Design a protein around this nucleic acid. Structure first.
Ligand code: NA
Ligand code: NA
Lengths: 483, 483
DNA sequence: AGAGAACAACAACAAG
DNA sequence: CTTGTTGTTGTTCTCTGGTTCACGC
DNA sequence: GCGTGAA
DNA sequence: AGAGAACAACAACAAG
DNA sequence: CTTGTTGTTGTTCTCTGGTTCACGC
DNA sequence: GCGTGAA
């Protein structure tokens, strides 16, 4: 038990042999700190203890080709294993997924990613189900649904009606899922609000463009090195990138005026009304908070959609101290928040917010349809629960929730609040933690593309479609079912 | 001694624990096969044997930060060590270096790379001396020479007159080395011949451009997937890339006509006189042989410069069976080979070729200056050799070489031929293997940039200038002084 | 050339 | 014999040859 | 002073 | 958000 | 006390949100 | 049939 430490002169040879691994095999300094790398050294000291210090390393060490073939083998294994645990969630309603498409930068295979999302031991599960190519079929709806089913047939899922799907409004995607539950990613919606709002306020184009021309010049003249925080990409459309550049420009205002002065290029910054820039950055600062809040799948996010909208109605509260150009932006942004964000919300966004214990808010109209909604879902739990055998009624259990009060203490976790409430509310708290499992966005699947890209790289470019789907699910699995 | 193998059920857990390293820590399948990775497992089985199977892995395993600090520490160590072995070569004449500049794709620091080249135990040493930033000084000659000296002062080299330098004709570089021995990279020269030759034969622009428009369309329409050998980049100037595209296009002729036919885009290939394309590819095929021959620093290359030129005079031998457009190219190419390649050769390229045992060739004029050259260098050996103490004369030893004959057997290694000849020729064979050490090009330093780029990557982007210079020299060192 | 990666396609070989 | 599991070959894909110095008229 | 050349 | 990387700048701590 | 060697913090940099489907007039 | 929208 008591893991013995090693002599000082011994460990001087660990950092002597590790720093040789990294220079000879061109590997990252932080490979040594990897949760998988350590367990693989546990195994090699054990074997050393067993067979002594004169073992056939070559022979005993596997071959990359077989390592390739084992991940391919172990892939199917771990898929079958949870083939049951997954199958549970989809049956017992509370399973949500997010899908989107993505295309790699070397072969350019169209890819479809799927994740899955459910609640368990007072914790959330963001698991990467599949990432399969369409080889090169047209990205048509029916081909997508074709490959959607194939991911779920891997774990023996097949009704996929009880599944709540969360995607962007990509026309081809939207149609694929017209047969089942589909929730609109609120990050694309929010991004749509910004995009359309700033398009609709071209009074602000003059400041912005000039900023972009600053960044563009700093990149071209090889002088981002004199900044303590280099200036960011203009508008290659990374969600809220317009705030991003503006801040990095503002956060380096003094150094920039100085650098441009030395260049004699002072001409191209003086026309920038900084007063406005600043004002934009404060207004969008509130927004960036909502972006990160809604990219969370390790804590309930769906429920935070409605109150975010109110914060935006408030950042954009009309104020008689504003220059007309900002007045226009706030005017426009409240307009889009209505016709774009509100317009594409559903009773999954309200009900998720209803199950927030400060339930005082949505007192108006919405409870009459939420009650209609809430009742019919708890009824489908029982339906599928009676199939599992082979006073205190819900319509009142509802209003017993509506009478309670709570405070919003900074340590409050409404996810834990329902695990610690299932006794009095046995069948409603199973509905709640089912909705708190739904992610407010498809950012999960977005990270899968980030991850996928982390694998299929310059040197690793020969990598196969199956190798990638395996390696992803595995990594994802060894995170949801291991410590 | 007899390294014992492990049980079958034990190794099933090696490939069970290795395939977990690779999915959890997103690492290449071929990390398991790395010459540095194995020696680092040798150490961990040994320690397991010693302290048993219940060791504190965490505590004993180093920290990335320290791993960073050890490579930085061990860097200076290994630099001082060979501080002597290096210092030898530069003193004893037979040291050659290659330098060039390069700028990384994330910080864009101007970089200066240096390698060193000498002969020893019948083998060649391509060693990466330095890769240091100019931070952000102008890439001016005197700044370059400033940083040139700083690399050589690391190993306590300081006269750097006896050093033979090999670089491209970059104006700023060329001047830095105007004080010492500087040989023109024959790959840039050869590349200059192609470039200027094809510029000077615009009759061939019509076929070529149409090919480039083929590639450009295959990339844009996502249909390189139906090729068994995708079509290559048009003209982003990778040395002989014009042959490269042409071959990949030709090597997929039938599939391309078919793919374009399906697209209805048959219009954009039919005007390509394939007859010519083919002819270009045969002519440039000979050339690509010379490119790879001259990028070699693990075998003498300098000596193969002159005879290559003759092969080109021969690939381009005038032939009455040629369409005028190819006649023009060969006409132009013999013209540039003279005024570009020949024009920038020196008696280091002839003398290196003289020390090829089929010495019958260069019988004309050149021996009268080579004898003038050859004598004065063997005289400087003695000069520095007499300082090392603190009949059969050279002018005849010369012509004793000129009388011999040899055959060009396919297994002949003229590098080994001089190690097996030093007895009769004690002071001339030291001159020979000094010149056979000089690389015909700066391709060595080019690979260093390839290597450098392999380190400073997307995720590893924070990497420091010192970290990179270290990691390079180390990797380079553990290859020239280890088995 | 030099490096880094991955497979297809075998060939070997083994279990059944 | 058929399966299934390996190991080895060879084939394919990357990547650095890159934009501002120095000079002469 | 500006074009040319080579990277 | 989630992931991967690296340091500067400390703080700890130790040797001398 | 001064050195030198560590370990820990926090700050900075990456990266996926991406171009062709589906629809309606 | 072609524009518009959303990616
Ligand atoms: Na998409
Ligand atoms: Na260069």
């Amino acid at each position: 038990r008591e893991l013995k430490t090693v002599s000082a002169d011994c460990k001087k040879e660990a950092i002597e042999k590790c720093a040789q691994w990294v220079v000879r095999d061109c590997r990252p300094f932080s490979a040594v700190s990897g949760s998988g790398f350590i367990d693989m050294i546990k195994f090699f000291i054990k074997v050393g203890a067993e067979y002594g210090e004169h073992v056939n390393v070559e022979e005993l060490l596997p071959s990359p080709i077989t390592l390739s073939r084992k991940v391919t083998s172990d892939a199917k294994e771990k898929k079958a294993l949870i083939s049951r645990e997954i199958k549970s969630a989809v049956e017992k309603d509370g399973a949500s997924a997010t899908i989107d498409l993505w295309t790699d930068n070397y072969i350019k295979r169209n890819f479809l990613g799927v994740t899955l999302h459910y609640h368990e031991n007072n914790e959330l599960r963001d698991l990467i189900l599949g990432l399969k190519s369409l080889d090169f079929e047209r990205s048509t709806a029916e081909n997508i649904y074709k490959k959607l089913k194939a991911i779920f047939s891997q774990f023996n899922v097949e009704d996929l009606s009880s599944i709540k799907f969360v995607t962007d409004r990509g026309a081809n995607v939207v149609k694929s899922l017209a047969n089942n539950i589909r929730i609109n990613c609120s990050s694309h919606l929010l991004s749509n609000v910004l995009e359309n709002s700033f398009e609709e306020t071209p009074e602000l184009n003059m400041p912005i463009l000039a900023c972009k021309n600053i960044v563009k010049y700093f990149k071209k003249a090889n002088l981002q090195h004199r900044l303590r925080s280099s200036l960011k990409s203009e508008c290659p459309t990374r969600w809220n990138s317009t705030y991003t550049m503006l801040r990095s420009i503002l956060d380096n205002w003094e150094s920039v005026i100085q650098i441009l002065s030395e260049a004699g290029e002072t001409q191209r910054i003086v026309h920038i009304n900084k007063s406005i820039i600043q004002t934009m950055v404060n207004i969008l600062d509130g927004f960036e908070r909502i972006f990160k809040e809604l990219q969370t799948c390790s804590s309930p996010s769906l429920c935070f959609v409605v109150p975010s909208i109110l914060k935006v109605k408030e950042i954009c509260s009309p104020d008689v101290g504003d220059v007309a150009d900002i007045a226009k932006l706030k005017v426009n942004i409240i307009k889009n928040v209505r016709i774009i964000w509100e317009e594409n919300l559903s009773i999954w966004h309200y009900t998720a917010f209803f199950f927030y214990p400060p339930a005082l808010h949505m007192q108006q109209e919405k409870v009459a349809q939420i009650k209609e909604f809430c009742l019919s879902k708890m009824e489908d739990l029982e339906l599928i629960n009676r199939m599992s055998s082979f006073p205190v009624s819900p319509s009142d259990e509802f209003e017993f929730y509506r009478k309670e009060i709570v405070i919003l203490s900074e340590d409050f976790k409404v996810m834990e609040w329902w695990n610690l409430n299932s006794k009095k509310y046995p069948k409603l708290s199973k509905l709640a933690l089912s909705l708190l499992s739904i992610p407010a966005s498809s950012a999960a699947s977005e990270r899968t593309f980030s991850l996928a890209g982390n694998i299929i790289t310059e040197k690793r470019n020969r990598i196969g479609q199956q190798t990638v789907d395996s390696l992803l699910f595995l990594n994802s699995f060894y995170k949801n079912f291991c410590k």
